Every structure is written in C-alpha cells, then in structure tokens.
Design a protein around this ligand. Sequence first.
Ligand SMILES: *[C@@H]1O[C@H](CO)[C@@H](O[C@@H]2O[C@H](CO)[C@@H](O[C@@H]3O[C@H](CO)[C@@H](O)[C@H](O)[C@H]3NC(C)=O)[C@H](O)[C@H]2NC(C)=O)[C@H](O)[C@H]1NC(C)=O
Ligand SMILES: *[C@@H]1O[C@H](CO)[C@@H](O[C@@H]2O[C@H](CO)[C@@H](O[C@@H]3O[C@H](CO)[C@@H](O)[C@H](O)[C@@H]3O)[C@H](O)[C@H]2NC(C)=O)[C@H](O)[C@H]1NC(C)=O
Ligand SMILES: *[C@@H]1O[C@H](CO)[C@@H](O[C@@H]2O[C@H](CO)[C@@H](O[C@@H]3O[C@H](CO)[C@@H](O)[C@H](O)[C@@H]3O)[C@H](O)[C@H]2NC(C)=O)[C@H](O)[C@H]1NC(C)=O
Ligand SMILES: *[C@@H]1O[C@H](CO)[C@@H](O[C@@H]2O[C@H](CO)[C@@H](O)[C@H](O)[C@H]2NC(C)=O)[C@H](O)[C@H]1NC(C)=O
Ligand SMILES: *[C@@H]1O[C@H](CO)[C@@H](O[C@@H]2O[C@H](CO)[C@@H](O)[C@H](O)[C@H]2NC(C)=O)[C@H](O)[C@H]1NC(C)=O
Ligand SMILES: *[C@@H]1O[C@H](CO)[C@@H](O[C@@H]2O[C@H](CO)[C@@H](O)[C@H](O)[C@H]2NC(C)=O)[C@H](O)[C@H]1NC(C)=O
Ligand SMILES: *[C@@H]1O[C@H](CO)[C@@H](O[C@@H]2O[C@H](CO)[C@@H](O)[C@H](O)[C@H]2NC(C)=O)[C@H](O)[C@H]1NC(C)=O
Ligand SMILES: *[C@@H]1O[C@H](CO)[C@@H](O)[C@H](O)[C@H]1NC(C)=O
Ligand SMILES: *[C@@H]1O[C@H](CO)[C@@H](O)[C@H](O)[C@H]1NC(C)=O
Ligand SMILES: *[C@@H]1O[C@H](CO)[C@@H](O)[C@H](O)[C@H]1NC(C)=O
Ligand SMILES: *[C@@H]1O[C@H](CO)[C@@H](O)[C@H](O)[C@H]1NC(C)=O
Ligand SMILES: *[C@@H]1O[C@H](CO)[C@@H](O)[C@H](O)[C@H]1NC(C)=O
Ligand SMILES: *[C@@H]1O[C@H](CO)[C@@H](O)[C@H](O)[C@H]1NC(C)=O
Ligand SMILES: *[C@@H]1O[C@H](CO)[C@@H](O)[C@H](O)[C@H]1NC(C)=O
Ligand SMILES: [Ca+2]
Length: 942
Amino acid sequence: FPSAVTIKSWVDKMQEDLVTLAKTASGVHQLVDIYEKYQDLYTVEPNNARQLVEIAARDIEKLLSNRSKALVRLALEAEKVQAAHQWREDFASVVYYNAKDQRIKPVFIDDANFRRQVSYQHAAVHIPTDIYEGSTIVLNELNWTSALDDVFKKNREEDPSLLWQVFGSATGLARYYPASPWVKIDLYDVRRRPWYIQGAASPKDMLILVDVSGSVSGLTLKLIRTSVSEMLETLSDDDFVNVASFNSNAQDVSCFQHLVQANVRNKKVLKDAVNNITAKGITDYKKGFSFAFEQLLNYNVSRANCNKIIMLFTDGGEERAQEIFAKYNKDKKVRVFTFSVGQHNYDRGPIQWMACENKGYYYEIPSIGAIRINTQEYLDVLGRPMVLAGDKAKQVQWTNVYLDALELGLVITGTLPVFNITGQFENKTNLKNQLILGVMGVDVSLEDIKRLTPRFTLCPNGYYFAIDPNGYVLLHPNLQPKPIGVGIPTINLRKRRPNVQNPKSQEPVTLDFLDAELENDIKVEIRNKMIDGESGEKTFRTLVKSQDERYIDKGNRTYTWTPVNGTDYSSLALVLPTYSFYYIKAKIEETITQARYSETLKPDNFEESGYTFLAPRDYCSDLKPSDNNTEFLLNFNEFIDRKTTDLINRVLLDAGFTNELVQNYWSKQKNIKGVKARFVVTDGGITRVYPKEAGENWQENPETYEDSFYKRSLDNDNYVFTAPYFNKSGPGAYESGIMVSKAVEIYIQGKLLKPAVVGIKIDVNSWIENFTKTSIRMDCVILDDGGFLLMANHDDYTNQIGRFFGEIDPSLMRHLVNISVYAFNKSYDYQSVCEPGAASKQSCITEQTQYFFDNDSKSFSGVLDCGNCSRIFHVEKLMNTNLIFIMVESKGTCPCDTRLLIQAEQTSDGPDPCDMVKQPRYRKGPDVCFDNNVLEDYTDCX
Ligand SMILES: *[C@@H]1O[C@H](CO)[C@@H](O[C@@H]2O[C@H](CO)[C@@H](O[C@@H]3O[C@H](CO)[C@@H](O)[C@H](O)[C@H]3NC(C)=O)[C@H](O)[C@H]2NC(C)=O)[C@H](O)[C@H]1NC(C)=O
Ligand SMILES: *[C@@H]1O[C@H](CO)[C@@H](O[C@@H]2O[C@H](CO)[C@@H](O[C@@H]3O[C@H](CO)[C@@H](O)[C@H](O)[C@@H]3O)[C@H](O)[C@H]2NC(C)=O)[C@H](O)[C@H]1NC(C)=O
Ligand SMILES: *[C@@H]1O[C@H](CO)[C@@H](O[C@@H]2O[C@H](CO)[C@@H](O[C@@H]3O[C@H](CO)[C@@H](O)[C@H](O)[C@@H]3O)[C@H](O)[C@H]2NC(C)=O)[C@H](O)[C@H]1NC(C)=O
Ligand SMILES: *[C@@H]1O[C@H](CO)[C@@H](O[C@@H]2O[C@H](CO)[C@@H](O)[C@H](O)[C@H]2NC(C)=O)[C@H](O)[C@H]1NC(C)=O
Ligand SMILES: *[C@@H]1O[C@H](CO)[C@@H](O[C@@H]2O[C@H](CO)[C@@H](O)[C@H](O)[C@H]2NC(C)=O)[C@H](O)[C@H]1NC(C)=O
Ligand SMILES: *[C@@H]1O[C@H](CO)[C@@H](O[C@@H]2O[C@H](CO)[C@@H](O)[C@H](O)[C@H]2NC(C)=O)[C@H](O)[C@H]1NC(C)=O
Ligand SMILES: *[C@@H]1O[C@H](CO)[C@@H](O[C@@H]2O[C@H](CO)[C@@H](O)[C@H](O)[C@H]2NC(C)=O)[C@H](O)[C@H]1NC(C)=O
Ligand SMILES: *[C@@H]1O[C@H](CO)[C@@H](O)[C@H](O)[C@H]1NC(C)=O
Ligand SMILES: *[C@@H]1O[C@H](CO)[C@@H](O)[C@H](O)[C@H]1NC(C)=O
Ligand SMILES: *[C@@H]1O[C@H](CO)[C@@H](O)[C@H](O)[C@H]1NC(C)=O
Ligand SMILES: *[C@@H]1O[C@H](CO)[C@@H](O)[C@H](O)[C@H]1NC(C)=O
Ligand SMILES: *[C@@H]1O[C@H](CO)[C@@H](O)[C@H](O)[C@H]1NC(C)=O
Ligand SMILES: *[C@@H]1O[C@H](CO)[C@@H](O)[C@H](O)[C@H]1NC(C)=O
Ligand SMILES: *[C@@H]1O[C@H](CO)[C@@H](O)[C@H](O)[C@H]1NC(C)=O
Ligand SMILES: [Ca+2]
C-alpha cells in the first residue's frame, strides 16, 4: 500500500530520466540551431492550399480531356469504315493476331509503361473460347475493324503514354493496341466487362421476379439460382435492384422490402437469399406482377429514375396476365424481359406474349453455358432508346476504378458507344439500325493521375484525394490493389477438385469515403458538400488513424476542395495540417557546397556518417530498389557524377544538415553509456543511423512518406514511444529496443516548420537497470498510448515487450476503459487478406480496435474489485511524453481469468446491410438518361 505523494515524486524521477536522455542524445535542440544558423540556403515558400487545388484540378481535367478526345476519333472512324463494307460471305482471300497463343507472330519490345511485352505495330484480338471457327459473323468483323489500325497507331504519335485502347464489340471481340500476349481456362467475355455494361446503356431500376412454385423444382430451379447470380454481375454501381419471389402469395426474399443500391456488398445479400430458395406452391401471376409494379413505385426511397425493368424467371404457365398490364402499363413504361429456363415441356406461349406487348424481349435458357450468353444480350434492348439520339448520346462515360485484366494496376476507363450508320442522310428502309456496334474504351492508370498530384511539398500527413458522384474514391492513399468486400470467406476443401483456377471476379474496387477514413459527423458534412458542392474548406479537430493501425492521434486538418471544372465525375481535396502551409525550397548557389554535400552521401563513409539510406523517388533514368537501397544509392551517385530539379536540390541540402548532427554532435560523444542507436529521419528521404553495427537491423521502410512513425511524431508536441511487434518474424526485440521520437520545430522569421524527426532507440536492458534501482531508493507496468507493454518488473512480462496489455491482465484493462483513459474506436478495413474458415489467402473484412487517451488530469486513482480478492490501482500519466504508469497490486492473490481484450485484427462480417440500407448514404446519380422514343419499333423479341 504505497502513498500518492511518494509515487508521484517517483514518477517525476522517471520523467526526468527519459526526457533528459532524449534531449542529450538526440540533437533536437542542437539541430534547430543548425537550421537557425543557415538562414540562407532557403526561401520558405507557401503552399496556399487553394492555388494547389485549382492547378491540380486543371491537369486532372486536361488528362481526362486529352484522352477523351481520342475516343471521338475512334468513334468517328469506326463508323465511317463501317458504312463501306458490303458483307463478304466467302473468305478465300483476314490476317489478324489472335492473342491467345492466317496469323501473325511479330517482334516484342520489353516496355515499361505497360510493364510488359508490347508490339506497337498490330492490334491483338481476343475471341472468347466459347465462340469461333471462322463463323462469318466473327470473321467478317475482323475485316472492317482492321481499319482502326491506322487510328490506334495515330494516337500514340499524337500523345504518348496512352494505355490500352480497345474496341469491344457486340459479337465479343476485342481489338486492343498495343498488341500483347494475353494472360487454365480464360473466361473473359468482353461484353460483360464493367467498362462495357456502363457505356452501353443508361442506369437501371431492375426488379427480378423468380417463380418459386412447385413446378420449378428439379433442374429448372438450379438454373435460376445460377442465373440470378450471373444476372446481378451485370450491374454497375448506379443501377438498383431487388429480388422478389412469387408463388401462392408474394415476398421479397432478400431482407430488404424495397429497392437497394447494388453495391458490391448489397449484391451479396441477394446471392445468399437466392441460393436458399425453396420450391413449393401454386403459380398465379396476378399476385406476382401486382407486387412487381408496386416496388417500381415507392418514390419514397431514392431510386435512379430511369429504365424500369421487370425480369421474369418462370418455367411456364397458361396465364396471360391481361388484367394487370392494363392496370399499370397503360403508358408502356415498364420493359418486361421474360426468361424460360430448363427443359420443361410446358407452354412457352404466354411467356412470349408478356414480353412482346411490353417492349420486352423473350429469351430462353436450355442449360448451364447458355447462361453467360443470354444474360448479357439483355443490354442490346436497352440500347434501343440511345441509338435514336445519336447526335447527343455520345457523351463520355467514365468507369469508377477496377483492376485491369492485363495486369496494369488500378485503371479507370473512358467509354463511348459506336453506333451503326449505314443509311443515314440518304435515309433508307433503315432495317436494323437500332443496335450498337460496341464500345471504345481508353484506360487511365491511377498512377498517371498521381503523377499529376505531387505529394512531396506537403507534410507527410498531407495528401490529395478525389471523390466520384456516387461517393467513391479515386486517389485516397489508403486504396491499394487487391479486391475489397463481402464477409468471412467460407471455403470447404471437401468439395473442390484437383482442377479449375476458381475464377478471377470482375468485381470493381469501390472504396467508400466513409470507409477509407474514420467516420465522423463533420466528414459526412464534408462529403455531402463535396459530392456536388462548388467550393469549401473546414478546419476541425479529428481522429487521425496512424499508418499501421496501432494508434490514434488527434490533430488539426484544414482541408479544402473544388470540383473538376470540366467533367463532373470527380471532385478533389487537398488535405493539409496547420503546420504544413510553409515548406523548404532548396536553393544552392556555390557548387562547391553541394559538391561536398555529395561526398557525404557515398557509401565509403558509413564509419564516419553512418548507415545512410535514400528513399525511392522520381527522376529521369532510375528504378525502384527491391530492398537493395545500396543499389539505388550507388545509382544515385552515378546521377550526381554525370551532373558534375528540386528533389535533387533538396536531398543534397538535407544531407548537408544531417551531416552536421553527426560530425559535430555525435562524433563528439562516441558510444554513450545508454541509448542503443541514434537515428535521424527527415523529409527528402535521408534516414541516418549512427553506429551502423546494430543499425543494420533498422527494419523500417526507407520511404519517409510511407513511414509509420514519422507521421505520428509530427502531430504530437512531445516524446512518442513506439512499442515494437512481438515475434514479428524475427529479432526486433531485446536485440532492437524501443524508440523515442520528437519532431523539430523551426523558427524562421515568424512561421512554423517541422521538417525533421530525430530519434533514439532505447536499449532495453539499461532502462531496466534504472527502473529497479530507483525502487530500492508492487507490480509496476510502463504502458503507452495504446495498451502496449513497454517495460515492467516481475520479469514474466519482459518476455512480452510490445504485446497489448489486454492479453496480459484483462481485468485491469476492461476496467480501465470503463473509467475513462483510455477510450477507443472500432473501424473496418475492407481490404485485409485473411485465411478462409470452415464449412490459400483471400480478402475479408477485419475489425480494427485502436485505443487512445481521452482527457487531461494525469492522476487516476481507483480500486478494482473482481470478487473475494480486491486490489488497488494507481494510474499515473507521465508528463511531456506519451506514457501511462500503472501500479497494480499483487498478481499473487486469487485470479480472475475471464477473457481477453484483443487488439490486432479479427476477421468479421460487415455492418448489418439490412439496417445499413434503411437510411442510406446521400449520393447523386448522373443527369442524362435515355428511355422511350416514339419510334423504336418493337417487332423482334421472339
Ligand atoms: C539512467 O541511465 C542513464 C544511462 O543510460 C543515466 O544517464 C546519464 O546520467 C548522468 C548523470 O545522471 C548524466 O551526466 C551528466 O551529463 C551532462 C551532459 O552530458 C553533464 O553536463 C553533467 O555534468 C553530467 N552530470 C554530472 C553529475 O556530472 C549523463 O548525461 C546521462 N546520460 C544521458 C545520455 O543523458 C541516468 O542518469 C540514469 N538514471 C538515473 C536516475 O541515474
Ligand atoms: C476487308 O477485306 C477485303 C478483302 O477480304 C478488303 O477488300 C479489298 O480492298 C482493296 C481496296 O479496297 C481491293 O484492292 C483493289 O484491287 C483491284 C484489283 O483487284 C484494283 O482494281 C483496285 O484499284 C483496288 O486496289 C481488294 O481487291 C479487295 N479484296 C477483295 C477480295 O475484294 C477490304 O479492304 C477489307 N476492309 C478493310 C477496311 O481493310
Ligand atoms: C448494321 O446494320 C445493317 C442494317 O442496315 C446490317 O446490315 C445487314 O446485316 C445482315 C447481317 O445478318 C445482312 O444479312 C445477310 O444478307 C446476305 C445477303 O448478302 C444474306 O446472304 C445473309 O444470309 C444475311 O441475310 C444484310 O444484308 C445487311 N444489310 C445490307 C443492306 O447489307 C449490318 O450488319 C449492321 N452492322 C453490323 C456490324 O452488324
Ligand atoms: C412512403 O410510403 C408509405 C406507405 O407505406 C406512406 O405511408 C402512408 O402515408 C399516407 C399519407 O398520405 C397515410 O395516409 C398512410 O396511412 C400511410 N401508410 C401507412 C401504412 O401508414 C408514406 O407517406 C410514404 N412517404 C414517406 C415519406 O414515407
Ligand atoms: C470553372 O473555373 C473557373 C475559374 O477557373 C470559374 O470561373 C469563376 O467564375 C465566377 C463567377 O461565375 C467568378 O466569381 C470567379 O472569379 C471565377 N473564377 C476565377 C478563377 O476567376 C468557373 O465558375 C468554373 N465553372 C463553373 C461552372 O463554376
Ligand atoms: C542488395 O544489393 C547489393 C549490391 O550492391 C548487395 O551487396 C552485395 O551482396 C553480395 C551478396 O550478399 C556480396 O557478396 C557483395 O560483397 C555485396 N557488395 C557488392 C559491392 O557487391 C546486397 O547484399 C543486396 N541485398 C540483398 C538483400 O540482396
Ligand atoms: C470514436 O471515438 C470518439 C472519441 O472522441 C468518440 O466520440 C465521443 O463519443 C462519446 C460516446 O459516444 C461521446 O460522449 C463524446 O462526446 C464523443 N466525442 C466527440 C468529440 O464526438 C466516437 O463516438 C467514437 N466512434 C466510434 C464509432 O466508436
Ligand atoms: C495534352 O495533349 C498534348 C498533345 O500531344 C500533349 O502534348 C500534352 O502534353 C497533353 N497534356 C498533358 C498535361 O499531358
Ligand atoms: C437460408 O440460407 C441463408 C444463408 O446461409 C441463411 O442465413 C438462412 O438461415 C437460411 N434459411 C433457412 C430456413 O435455412
Ligand atoms: C489546433 O490548433 C490550435 C491553435 O493553434 C492548437 O491550440 C491545438 O492544440 C490544435 N489541435 C490539436 C488537436 O493539437
Ligand atoms: C508468438 O508469441 C507467442 C507468445 O504469446 C507464442 O506463444 C507464439 O508461439 C509466437 N509465435 C511464433 C511464430 O514465434
Ligand atoms: C462502464 O460504463 C458503462 C457505460 O457508461 C456504465 O453503464 C457502467 O456502469 C460502467 N461500469 C462501472 C463499473 O461503473
Ligand atoms: C477524464 O476522466 C477522469 C477519470 O477519473 C476524470 O477525473 C476527469 O475529470 C475527466 N475529464 C473530463 C474533462 O471530464
Ligand atoms: C470466495 O468466497 C466464496 C464465498 O463467499 C467462496 O465460496 C469462494 O471459494 C472464494 N473464492 C476465492 C477465489 O477466494
Ligand atoms: Ca408453374
């Protein structure tokens, strides 16, 4: 039973230790004087936030205008060549490429924009392996499409760095220049690609009715459970659905009861509802359709207000529901596509009738295999209103982000339909002009937009970002490839085969603005203002998740936004802290001075300067080191010695200042008693570790803007203690020790600049030795921001260093959150890969529970009562630093091993989507839309 004055005097002894050891060993107060002394070699220039945003909006506008324009050239030529064709029937005269293996076998160049072998002299062709022998529908369309060869080749010379041009086509071919070898079974139908089903129709309020009566059971039900799952893959993220069965009565076997958004997530609820359909009852078709036309009302919701589709997966029946379409379809504004599946011997008579009265189109499905071809030809009917406005339907329609099939990265496509002009201005009988040919696509990699958005003048905390009218993400730096979505991934191994590659999931990567950052009632008000807003900034105190999900910091974010002045399929946001409005412009003028700076950077001097490491960056002719930063550093010296424009000027100025911490403050100390290894990480990407012997175990990412502790120490105005991983793979441990950090504030003529982070990596053993000799002059735990053990007595805990305290003594920690200090948050990360459960690596949703300090008052006294043992806590925060000191009495007396508070990530389901739809997230759909011309002429279907 200790006493509070004696404890607080003893905490203030450990406070004055770790602070004074930090100020002496790190050259923090010495390095400011280095930055103060050289008042020259600067002109500190502002960022201005705004002026950055309007300039970077004009380049993202011109990039989508430069490539977009090319689309018009491919659409104008493709149609021109299509008029003069004359339909050859025999083919004894053609020579294309067939990229899956007369034909061509050309030369290949290893090229680096494509990261792959390209040709530049031919287009390649992908004919899906369901189709082909020479069948003169395919073979004739290789004829006129060969003309687009000159115009594909034209646009590389007009503007380089174009990625894949592509003409998709309604018969399934793809010509794409540059020609390249296509990447056991290759499924890949181009007509079901999100970039085709997007610019091939207008958005869609679908409603799927599924006959679940007693007559569908058997084969013809199993084809409906497959075909709805193959139907819903043809929906973009502007399209809405619902799935409704009918039988005796009617019901929306989905758990939604109205129309939903057809996200990645909301389509998964439907694929578990459809796969648990039972089959029993009596068909009636009158309680069914009258439930279908009510759902396509409900204006209450927030539908898209466009092509209304009722799709029908019945088997058969003798019921023309004539009393219903006269009730609801007098104005003929609901297209009804009807499918009739399986090999039932029923009456297909009425089902053909329902679709040819209601501008529909009857389809038929014999078996599995016809499912992929039939449920995509339903978009040729929806293109019928678009072709009748061919002067003004050629807008450009950009697709929201998805992974390329050729292995390029995240790419965004621009699409434009190509329509059949073969009589026009002469007009003509005009027989089948009411169908499109295909869609021209032009890719942009998001790296090419990131080339436009420089992330190296703003503090590593600052970053650009961009939101598309459905409230999803182009440039938030928390995206990364790998698909996202859905929940706990159950795979049984008791069902698979020694066979097929388990297909590649054409799903797009749609991250929500509320699920990249932390959800807050201000950032909602930002997004709903940013999604259509004209201009606005807001400065506020938020929770900022740290880059590795250990920690939560609290800082001031001043961010602003503006729309793209051209297209409206994006709007940008430059994000800046309050201490990053001013940056350092390098300005070096003597040419001897920067020559001496280059001397320092050579690897010959690591005994004198130490282990210097130089972050991978951009210039003319270099690469990305695969951990061989030594190879990058030698290549970088070859850049200087050939030189004997601002990144090259900054790093040379940065090395010259981090030199004078070594040769003037660390060379005069020479292996201090304590510490373990001094380190300096700056922006400019020069991280130096002084001794170089155990500094080879510096296991951190040398790119400083991706670096996990550099960003944290800029926010806090004091010492930050990081706690290392436990086991981690390897020796970061006792062998490594724990770290200290403090950013470096600079006082130029009334301004605030924080360029550098200076740190110490504390020896674990020597700081044990003070900690126990101070106690002779009881169960003590040093515990940081986040519940991680830094050190402790009792020596069963020192085998744990860095493990979260909830897996040590949870009864303290479940208590300690319940009395404030420390609170938490729980966010979701949609892209974390984990292992599949029970019934190798794939994507899943993980929870992330991150603990952090709440109030002030660094004195928390209180008593814990579990039962029949009680014990007394004295929780004391150390001042001017990031630490809690806890005095807990006697593990010893009887335990309470109830459970564990567990950090790290746990595989979980998402939020409840049945409740998430109720009050959904504000959004705005496009404005065009095309439906119901007077002409049309519906006399096909059949
Ligand atoms: C915990 O262990 C540390 C060793 O890793 C000890 O740190 C050293 O303590 C010395 C005295 O406490 C300091 O000496 C002082 O150094 C300054 C500048 O170097 C001189 O101006 C002072 O004259 C000198 N003191 C005297 C009496 O001459 C060491 O600088 C210091 N090491 C560092 C890196 O700061 C801690 O003392 C030890 N904790 C306790 C409570 O003993
Ligand atoms: C599609 O393929 C056909 C052939 O499979 C191409 O037709 C060919 O077109 C060229 C020029 O239009 C013809 O050349 C002509 O030759 C005659 C003599 O034979 C000459 O008098 C003309 O001055 C002209 O040079 C060629 O004969 C013709 N081939 C056939 C079999 O008729 C057509 O060009 C292809 N389409 C595209 C867009 O490339
Ligand atoms: C663009 O639309 C036009 C319609 O104006 C399409 O032209 C027609 O295409 C069909 C293809 O089935 C041709 O039918 C074929 O005619 C030959 C006679 O030479 C016959 O032997 C075949 O059995 C078949 O019936 C039709 O002739 C043709 N119309 C004309 C005036 O030539 C054209 O196909 C569309 N473009 C594309 C790429 O689909
Ligand atoms: C959405 O639809 C519901 C129907 O479920 C509407 O609720 C009806 O509102 C009228 C108002 O004229 C009342 O007379 C009815 O009694 C309501 N129905 C029920 C079952 O109570 C609702 O008004 C619609 N609009 C909104 C915004 O919710
Ligand atoms: C596109 O951006 C331009 C400027 O880049 C905007 O022009 C502004 O026009 C308003 C009034 O219409 C003026 O008050 C501003 O001074 C103009 N801005 C500039 C830069 O001078 C234009 O408004 C933008 N387009 C739209 C549709 O808002
Ligand atoms: C990264 O690249 C450098 C090349 O400069 C490697 O350094 C050489 O490594 C080999 C094998 O370990 C040694 O035999 C040489 O003596 C090293 N120096 C030179 C100048 O060749 C370094 O080992 C590479 N790192 C990794 C992890 O592969
Ligand atoms: C994330 O943590 C913040 C910590 O501030 C939570 O915000 C506080 O929540 C409590 C209880 O909900 C309120 O009493 C406080 O007034 C809130 N403070 C502020 C500034 O809003 C927030 O609720 C947490 N969010 C989640 C999803 O856990
Ligand atoms: C726009 O296109 C022209 C045409 O080649 C090109 O020179 C220019 O660099 C493009 N703009 C940008 C920002 O790349
Ligand atoms: C139907 O299947 C779904 C998905 O597995 C499940 O949630 C639901 O409980 C099932 N219903 C019945 C009656 O088995
Ligand atoms: C935001 O700025 C104010 C004024 O400069 C400062 O006092 C405050 O500490 C900052 N907020 C945080 C969370 O640090
Ligand atoms: C990780 O550390 C825990 C200590 O709780 C230990 O039980 C486990 O075996 C370690 N794993 C590896 C791979 O070393
Ligand atoms: C923990 O917090 C909850 C929520 O405020 C409260 O109901 C409960 O009483 C607290 N626990 C104790 C032991 O007071
Ligand atoms: C923060 O929590 C502690 C818990 O004891 C309390 O003493 C302190 O007053 C709280 N601060 C505020 C501002 O409520
Ligand atoms: C605590 O006391 C109860 C009776 O009040 C007794 O039955 C129980 O065994 C005791 N448990 C411990 C752990 O002391
Ligand atoms: Ca039936």
